[PDB]
Design brief:
Two copies of one chain form a homodimer. Chain A has seven helices and six strands. By secondary structure, chain A is α/β, with parallel strands linked by helices. Chain A has a six-stranded mixed beta sheet, sandwiched between helices. The complex binds 2,5-anhydro-1-deoxy-1-phosphono-6-O-phosphono-D-glucitol (FDQ) (2 copies). Chains A, B: This is 6-phosphofructo-2-kinase/fructose-2,6-bisphosphatase 1.
């Protein structure tokens, strides 16, 4: 039996402002989740856990509170919002009214202007899944769209439903693959 | 056609120090804006302009440089920062870390400890708007939070966006209500 702790980075300065994308750092409370996740990891008493992050500051900074070392993966970088990077839902609807509607039609195949889609991201995550599905104890601190693609894989979900998976902030999903697919144990850390 | 000159008081001693609230007087440059606004008002050649201010020194002193008389309105007083009055962004984050985060969540409904919110202020400004929207030429020399509530009203803005309106110092917004809402002509006085 092995576990795969899929969690998202601690709340970022941009998450607080309701904005998407960017390479922002952790907010004061984001930092708190880092330490909160720290104590949690210690409470779990795992045998040689491998911590994987992305190149974004938010994930790195979350990891830096665990003391132990981490391996950075560019494939684990958040979906590129393209021309809509660092924008709010409103700004997107205002400056990109067409793209917004077009996106509500098909969420899986929607690709932002100058960016990628869940589909593109799926391709990008192929190597990550391959290495992840043959490792022992792993804590993958990533992002919302990435976490959904990975989660969906281990829970065999449709490309349709994939973009709607519950991947809130400060919540760690303890995945334990078993004979029929996988077992999820949701852990929420209040900070 | 009528105009509504919405401008903020001239820079105060506390504005220079990066502090909020208080009942401070105009800095030497604040005074300069008073005279600068004076010459501007004379350049505009208006017919019987009514000058409305608040009870705070900064607005009164700005008006006192126009020569003409002014009517003071307590409803036009700046939002009460409560327990955070006369503090800097840092001091607030230091001594009131929780309130600061709590405020970043909802800006419209955030109420300072022992003070008011944009929401409270909206209620307070009801009578001012009612009298303002039935007058002819008016110059309302007020403050940042007040100016946003008034501006937002005449430009029909959401309670969401309201707290983010551009209301810098030394800038006078010439509002001219027209059939579809209102017309704004931004005037900046360099001093
Ligand atoms: O983990 P993040 O990089 O912070 C991602 C966050 O998750 C959301 C993306 O997921 P949705 O498909 O639900 O919008 C973004 O709006 C937001 O930036
Ligand atoms: O017109 P004031 O009374 O000087 C107001 C000024 O405007 C700011 C309030 O507006 P924000 O919501 O942008 O902080 C204050 O920090 C500052 O004292």
């Amino acid at each position: 039996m092995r576990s795969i702790y899929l969690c998202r980075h601690g709340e970022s300065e941009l998450n607080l402002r309701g904005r998407i994308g960017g390479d922002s750092g952790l907010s004061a409370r984001g930092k708190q989740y880092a330490y909160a996740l720290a104590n949690f990891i210690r409470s779990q008493g795992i045998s040689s856990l491998k911590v994987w992050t992305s190149h974004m500051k938010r994930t790195i900074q979350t990891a830096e509170a665990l003391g132990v070392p981490y391996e950075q993966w560019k494939a684990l970088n958040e979906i590129d919002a393209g021309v809509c990077e660092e924008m709010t839902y409103e700004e997107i609807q205002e400056h990109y009214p067409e793209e917004f509607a077009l996106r509500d039609q098909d969420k899986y195949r929607y690709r932002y202007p100058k960016g990628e889609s869940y589909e593109d991201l799926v391709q990008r995550l192929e190597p990550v899944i391959m290495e992840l599905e043959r490792q022992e104890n792993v804590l993958v601190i990533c992002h919302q769209a990435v976490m959904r693609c990975l989660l969906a894989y281990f829970l065999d979900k449709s490309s349709d439903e994939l973009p709607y998976l519950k991947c809130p902030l400060h919540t760690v999903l303890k995945l334990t693959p078993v004979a029929y697919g996988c077992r999820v144990e949701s852990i929420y850390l209040n900070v």
